Design a protein around this ligand. Structure first.
Ligand SMILES: Cc1cc2nc3c(=O)[nH]c(=O)nc-3n(C[C@H](O)[C@H](O)[C@H](O)COP(=O)(O)OP(=O)(O)OC[C@H]3O[C@@H](n4cnc5c(N)ncnc54)[C@H](O)[C@@H]3O)c2cc1C
Ligand SMILES: CCCCCC/C=C\CCCCC(=O)O[C@H](COC(=O)CCCCCCC/C=C\CCCCCCCC)COP(=O)(O)OC[C@@H](O)CO
Length: 397
C-alpha cells in the first residue's frame, strides 16, 4: 500500500494517543499506528498517576479507567519506623490515582479517534523514510503488507525501546547504564494493604531504586521493584529481592500473584536533540521519565501535547527547519530540564547512601506531614533540616 497524511504518530500509548488527538483537533490529517494487536495490553506499568495531568490534558477522570484514588503517598526507610507522608491539606481530597492502564490507554486512543485520527493496530513501523532533507514517513506493516506512509511530521511515541528515533539517527536517546532501571512487578490479589496510600520502600532491599506497593482496591495491589542495572545483576536476582520483600511483609505474603511483568525505565537528564526536520520524539522514546520517581505517564501526555502544538505550527507554515523543530525542544526544556537535572543529581546521590543514613533522613523528613505533593517538597525539607546530605543539589532546590 501507499498513504499520505499530515501527521504520523508512531505508538499508541498515552504519549502517542495524546499527540494524535491534539494533532487531529488542530485540523491535521492524522494516523496513529500501534505495533501490538490491542491498545493498552498487556499492561507493563505500576499504573500510578498524580491528579493534575488529567486537568492539564483535558481528560475526564472516569471510574472505568481509575481502579483506586489515593489520599497520599508514604515513603519508608530501611527500618520502616515512621514514613514520610505526602497528602493534601484538605480533609478528603485525592492526590492521585492507580489506573487500569489498559482501559486508560484505550480511552486515550478513543479520544484520538473521536478527534479525527485514523488508528491502526497490529501495525508496526519498520523503518524511516527521508526526502528533501527531512523525515518524510515510515514503512509500516499493516494487514500483512508493507505500506509506505508519507507524512509532513512524524511524532515518535514508541516507548522505552525508542526504535524510530534510533533508526532515524538520533544518538542522544542512547542511555548510559547508570540511567537504566530494570523493573519487575507482580499484580497481586488477596493482599491486605491500605487503599488510601501508595507506598514506597527505600534501602538495600532495593538497591539504587525502590520497592513500591500501589493499591487497586478490593485486596489487589501492584507490587514491584526497580534497580539500576549496574547494581542488581540479572532479572532472577531482581525477582529474588522482590520475593524476599514480599516474604517479610505478612499482608503481602498471604496473597497470590496473577501477573509478572518486567520492563525498563530511564532515569536520565533531559537529552537533546529529540528532533530532526520532520520528526519529534515524545514520552519514553524521548527519555522523559522523571529520574527520581520513575514515572513517565504524565510526562508522555505533556510531551505529546507539546509535539502536537509545534507540529501544527510547522505544517501551517510549511516550515520543517531545525529552528521550527527547536520550538518543541524549547517547550520540553522549559518544562523538564531543570527539574530532571535536580532529580538526576538527587537519584545519583541517593544510590550511594547507607541504610543508616536513609533511616536518618526519613526520620528527619517524617517529622511533619508534607502537604505539597511533590519531590521538590521532599528535597526542600531535606535541604533545610539535613543540609549535609543534599549539598550537591545546592543550586537546584
Ligand atoms: C514496571 C514499570 C512500572 C512503571 N510504573 C509507572 C507508574 O506507576 N506511573 C508512571 O507514570 N510511570 C510508570 N512507568 C513508566 C510508564 O509506564 C511509561 O513512562 C509510559 O507507558 C510512557 O508512555 P509512552 O506513550 O511514552 O510509551 P508506551 O506506553 O510504552 O507506548 C509506546 C507504544 O509504542 C508501541 N510501539 C513500539 N514500537 C513500535 C513500532 N515499531 N511501531 C509502532 N508502535 C510501536 C508500543 O507497543 C507501545 O504501545 C512504569 C514502567 C514500568 C516498566
Ligand atoms: C529520602 C527521601 C528521598 C525520596 C525518594 C523518592 C522515592 C519515591 C518517589 C515518590 C514521589 C511521590 C510524589 O510526590 O509523586 C508525584 C509524581 O508522580 C509519581 O511519582 C508517580 C510515579 C510512580 C512511578 C513508578 C515507577 C516504577 C518503576 C521503577 C521504580 C524505580 C525508579 C527509581 C528512580 C530512582 C530513585 C532513587 C509528584 O511529584 P512532582 O512531579 O515532583 O510534583 C511537582 C510538579 O508539579 C513540578 O514541580
Amino acid at each position: 500500500g501507499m498513504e499520505t497524511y499530515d501527521v504520523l504518530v508512531v505508538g499508541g500509548g498515552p504519549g502517542g494517543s495524546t499527540a494524535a488527538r491534539y494533532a487531529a483537533k488542530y485540523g491535521l490529517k492524522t494516523l496513529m499506528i500501534e505495533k501490538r494487536p490491542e491498545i493498552g495490553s498487556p499492561v507493563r506499568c505500576g499504573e500510578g498517576l498524580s491528579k493534575g495531568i488529567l486537568n492539564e490534558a483535558d481528560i475526564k477522570a472516569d471510574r472505568s479507567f481509575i481502579a483506586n484514588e489515593v489520599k497520599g503517598a508514604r515513603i519508608y526507610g530501611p527500618s520502616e519506623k515512621r514514613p514520610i507522608i505526602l497528602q493534601s491539606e484538605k480533609a478528603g481530597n485525592e492526590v492521585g490515582y492507580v489506573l487500569e492502564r489498559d482501559k486508560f490507554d484505550k480511552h486515550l486512543a478513543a479520544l484520538a479517534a473521536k478527534a479525527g485520527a485514523d488508528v491502526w493496530v497490529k501495525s508496526p513501523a519498520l523503518g524511516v523514510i527521508k526526502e528533501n532533507g527531512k523525515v518524510a514517513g515510515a514503512k509500516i506493516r499493516h494487514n500483512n503488507e508493507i505500506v509506505d506512509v508519507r507524512a509532513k511530521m512524524v511524532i515518535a511515541a514508541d516507548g522505552f525501546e525508542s526504535e524510530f528515533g534510533r533508526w532515524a539517527g538520533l544518538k542522544s536517546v542512547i542511555l548510559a547504564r547508570n540511567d537504566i532501571i530494570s523493573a519487575l512487578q507482580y499484580r497481586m490479589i488477596n493482599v491486605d494493604v491500605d487503599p488510601d496510600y501508595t507506598d514506597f520502600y527505600l534501602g538495600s532491599i532495593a538497591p539504587a531504586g525502590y520497592i513500591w506497593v500501589f493499591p487497586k482496591g478490593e485486596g489487589m495491589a501492584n507490587v514491584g521493584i526497580g534497580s539500576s542495572i549496574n547494581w542488581i545483576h540479572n532479572r532472577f536476582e531482581l525477582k529474588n529481592y522482590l520475593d524476599r520483600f514480599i516474604e517479610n511483609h505478612p499482608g503481602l505474603k498471604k496473597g497470590q500473584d496473577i501477573q509478572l511483568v518486567t520492563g525498563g525505565v530511564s532515569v536520565s537528564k533531559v537529552k537533546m536533540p529529540i528532533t530532526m526536520p520532520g520528526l519529534m520524539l515524545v514520552g519514553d522514546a524521548a527519555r522523559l521519565i522523571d529520574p527520581i520517581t520513575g514515572g513517565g505517564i504524565a510526562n508522555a501526555i505533556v510531551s505529546g501535547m507539546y509535539a502536537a502544538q509545534v507540529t501544527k505550527e510547522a505544517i501551517e507554515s510549511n516550515d520543517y527547519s531545525p529552528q521550527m523543530m527547536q520550538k518543541y525542544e524549547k517547550l520540553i526544556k522549559e518544562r523538564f530540564e531543570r527539574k530532571h537535572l535536580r532529580n538526576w543529581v538527587a537519584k545519583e546521590k541517593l544510590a550511594m547512601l547507607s541504610d543508616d543514613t536513609l533511616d536518618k533522613l526519613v526520620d528527619i523528613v517524617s517529622e511533619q506531614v508534607l502537604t505539597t505533593i511533590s519531590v521538590e517538597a521532599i528535597l526542600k525539607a531535606i535541604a533545610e533540616k539535613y543540609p549535609e546530605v543534599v549539598k550537591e543539589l545546592e543550586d537546584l532546590i
